[PDB]
Amino acid sequence: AKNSETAAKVALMKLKMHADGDKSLPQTERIYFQVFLPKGSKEKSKPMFFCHRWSIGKAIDFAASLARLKNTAKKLRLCHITSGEALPLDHTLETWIAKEDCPLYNGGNIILEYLNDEEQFCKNVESYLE
């Protein structure tokens, strides 16, 4: 419900008001997320937008920057909000649009979390929204 297509579209207008990102991107090239930050972050989440053709690794790098997490044993990974899957670094965000299983939505939620190198999913994915 909170992670559905409709919930993402309903959140999208506020995300457009509040998100940071590279504003030289044409509007149609942008995908907006509420980005939930690693456990222990005082700020639970931050609104961000990305180029939809960026790789996950690029998006992670951009999000870590905005969240001031570039200032260890673990690497930051974007993780699907329902499956917990650490999205593969080389895939483009575009790859997740529309898909039947665990899509990404323009306006949706996503997780940024410290994982071990090679770790595949973040544990307790439901808890980021609890």
The beta strands (E) that lie in 1-130 are given as 30-36, 45-51, 75-79, 108-115
Residue 105 lies in a domain: yes
- Indicate which technique resolved this structure: X-ray
CA-based nearest residue to 66, from 50, 90, 82, 89: 50
To which H or E segment does residue 15 belong? helix 5-18
Q: Which two tokens stand for residue 105?
A: 């939505």
The token pair that represents 4 in the structure block = 């559905």
d(CA 61, CA 122): 18
CA distance 7 to 107: 8
What is the count of structural domains for the chain? 1
* Residue 53 within any structural domain of the chain: yes
**Amino acid occupying residue 113:** E
Buried b (16+ CB within 10 A) or exposed e, 54-69: bbbbbbbebbbebbee
Other Cβ atoms less than 10 A from the Cβ of 88: the count is 13
Nominal resolution (angstroms):
1.9
Please indicate, yes or no, if residue 12 is contained in any of the structural domains: yes
By residue range, what is the domain housing residue 74? 5-21+31-129
CATH number of the domain encompassing residue 13: 3.10.20.270
Q: What is the largest CA-CA distance in the chain?
A: 38
The answer to the question of residue 26 being in a domain is no
Q: How far apart are CA 37 and CA 57, in angstroms?
A: 16
Structural domain contains residue 81? yes
32: nearest Cα among 63, 65, 70: 63
Residue 58 lies in a domain: yes
Determine, yes or no, domain membership for 44.
yes
